[PDB]
Each structure stands twice: as structure tokens, then as C-alpha cells.
A paper describes a structure:
CD200 is a widely distributed membrane glycoprotein that regulates myeloid cell activity through its interaction with an inhibitory receptor (CD200R). CD200R is a member of a “paired receptor” family as in addition to this inhibitory receptor there is one very closely related gene with activating potential in humans and several in mice (Akkaya and Barclay, 2010; Wright et al., 2003). We report X-ray crystallography structures for the inhibitory CD200R, the activating receptor CD200RLa, and a complex between CD200R and CD200.
The structure of CD200RLa was solved after phase determination using crystals soaked in gadolinium chloride solution because molecular replacement (MR) phasing was unsuccessful. The structure of CD200RLa is very similar to that of CD200R, as expected due to their high amino acid sequence identity in their extracellular regions (86%). Superposition of the V-like domains of CD200R and CD200RLa reflects these differences with an average root mean square deviation (rmsd) of 2.05 Å over 106 Cα atoms whereas the C2-like domains superimpose with an rmsd of 0.6 Å over 80 Cα atoms. Despite CD200RLa sharing a high amino acid sequence identity with CD200R in the V-like domain (84% identity in residues 1–123), it gives minimal binding to CD200 (50-fold lower affinity; Wright et al., 2003). Comparison of the CD200R and CD200RLa sequences does not show simple changes in the contact residues that might explain why the activating receptor CD200RLa does not bind CD200, implying indirect effects. To investigate this, the structure of the V-like domain of CD200RLa was superimposed onto CD200R in complex with CD200. Residues 63 and 66 in the C′C″ loop differ between CD200R and CD200RLa and are at the periphery of the interaction with K63, making contact with F96 and L30 of CD200. Substitution of F114 for Leu in CD200RLa seems to cause the side chain of F36 to flip in the opposite direction into the core of the domain. This in turn leads to the destabilization of the NH2 region of CD200RLa and therefore disruption of the CD200 binding interface. Thus both regions are important in explaining why the CD200RLa does not bind CD200 and this argument was strengthened by the analysis of a CD200RLa triple mutant combining both regions (N63K, K66T, and L114F) that binds CD200 with a similar affinity as CD200R.
Residue numbers in the entry: 18 to 205
Amino acid sequence: QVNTTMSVQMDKKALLCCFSSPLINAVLITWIIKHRHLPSCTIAYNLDKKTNETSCLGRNITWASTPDHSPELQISAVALQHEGTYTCEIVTPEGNLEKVYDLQVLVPPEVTYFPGKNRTAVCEAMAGKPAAQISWTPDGDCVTKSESHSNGTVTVRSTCHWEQNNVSVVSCLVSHSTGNQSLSIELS
Ligand SMILES: *[C@@H]1O[C@H](CO)[C@@H](O)[C@H](O)[C@H]1NC(C)=O
Ligand SMILES: *[C@@H]1O[C@H](CO)[C@@H](O)[C@H](O)[C@H]1NC(C)=O
Ligand SMILES: *[C@@H]1O[C@H](CO)[C@@H](O)[C@H](O)[C@H]1NC(C)=O
Ligand SMILES: *[C@@H]1O[C@H](CO)[C@@H](O)[C@H](O)[C@H]1NC(C)=O
Ligand SMILES: *[C@@H]1O[C@H](CO)[C@@H](O)[C@H](O)[C@H]1NC(C)=O
């Protein structure tokens, strides 16, 4: 329930801090990783016996470094499969402690822009997470179509037409939390 929401972009490295203190007497540290559909996996470290185990092979999930006073999980390269709950269960001589992360994966859209026939322009934001928002300058008569994909990404495709014959150059803004992208299009 009490958790840290964390947003990480595709292909970037993510670091999930369990705690950072020389005072916490951790005997065993376990990360439990849960997904909506994908099966769960675990990385565990025995600080007493200096031994470790993993059921996360092929998921690019490891200990950032050997855990001591700053136990930290590392995702070397974030991918859609990484979205889920990351729970750090700490066993100390006094009892149990926990740190929960809710990891969200952001996918930047792949954009394209092009003029069409009869003073139309097309702006597309391919497979973004969340869906990108497309806006035009100046205002046109547009049709925007969004397609949700099974991986959680959304493709947005916009086609406009401008009445005013004083309009020769149009601008498309593709807004996204990972960064805005805009380009101007010369009408036919
Ligand atoms: C994390 O906390 C937020 C805000 O309270 C909540 O919306 C979300 O569902 C929680 N997630 C988990 C995995 O507990
Ligand atoms: C964890 O286990 C793997 C496989 O047994 C090992 O290669 C790795 O060095 C261990 N990690 C740490 C932080 O000791
Ligand atoms: C693991 O990450 C590396 C880059 O650090 C990447 O080349 C590889 O394809 C990734 N493997 C999986 C299964 O995600
Ligand atoms: C998500 O699905 C779309 C549509 O199949 C695909 O174009 C895109 O490459 C996928 N995204 C990722 C990050 O796998
Ligand atoms: C991206 O564009 C939107 C819409 O104009 C704006 O609200 C937002 O501040 C922009 N983001 C950045 C980082 O400039």
C-alpha cells in the first residue's frame, strides 16, 4: 500500500534503493518482483552467510553492487517487461521491514510528419506510453485516430486540412512526458 511511484524510460538504467543506513542490521534482503501478466521473480541476499540467489535470469535484474548498508536493485536496461511492483523485504533480528516501488515504464513515441494531397498534413506518434498528444498550429479540421496495442503503447495518427489559403506552413506538436517533439510541414 505505502509505496514510491517511479517512472523510468525505455533503455535507461533504473536503481531501486531498499534503504541507505549503516544502522539497519539486515540479516536477509529479498526483492520480490511482480507483474500484471508476466510471472514473478526474486533476488535474495544473505548478509550473515554472504550468499545470494536469483530466479530473475534473463530479466536484466541484479544487485547494483554487493548489498551491505545501501542494498539496491538495478535494471541495466529498462523494457516494458519491467513494469510492476518491486518489494524489498528486510529481515533483521527485531523483525521485518519493507520498501515498495511501483515501477512505470515510459516509451517515447516514434514521430513522423508529412504533407498530403490537397493541402493536408499528417502527424504520427507511433507506439508511445502513455499516448502522446497531437496538436496543430494554426487550428485545422482534423481527424485523430488512436490505436491501443496489447503491450500498453498507443499509436496516435492525425490528418488535418486548413480552409484559409493564407496557410502555407503548419506546425505539429507531439507532447509526451518523455519530451515534446515538433516540426513544421510545408503544405502542397
Ligand atoms: C502505490 O501508491 C499509489 C498512491 O497511493 C497507489 O495509487 C498505487 O496503487 C500503489 N501501488 C501499490 C503497488 O501498492
Ligand atoms: C548473485 O548470484 C549470482 C549467481 O549465483 C552471482 O554471479 C553474483 O555474483 C551474486 N551477486 C552478488 C551481489 O554477490
Ligand atoms: C539485457 O540488457 C542488455 C543491455 O544492457 C540488452 O542488450 C539485452 O538484450 C537485455 N536482455 C533482455 C532479455 O532484456
Ligand atoms: C508495442 O507494440 C507496437 C505495436 O505492435 C510495436 O510497434 C512496438 O514496437 C511495441 N513496443 C515495444 C516497446 O515493444
Ligand atoms: C510539452 O507541450 C505541452 C503542451 O503545449 C506543455 O504543456 C508542456 O509543458 C511541454 N513540455 C515541456 C517540457 O516543454
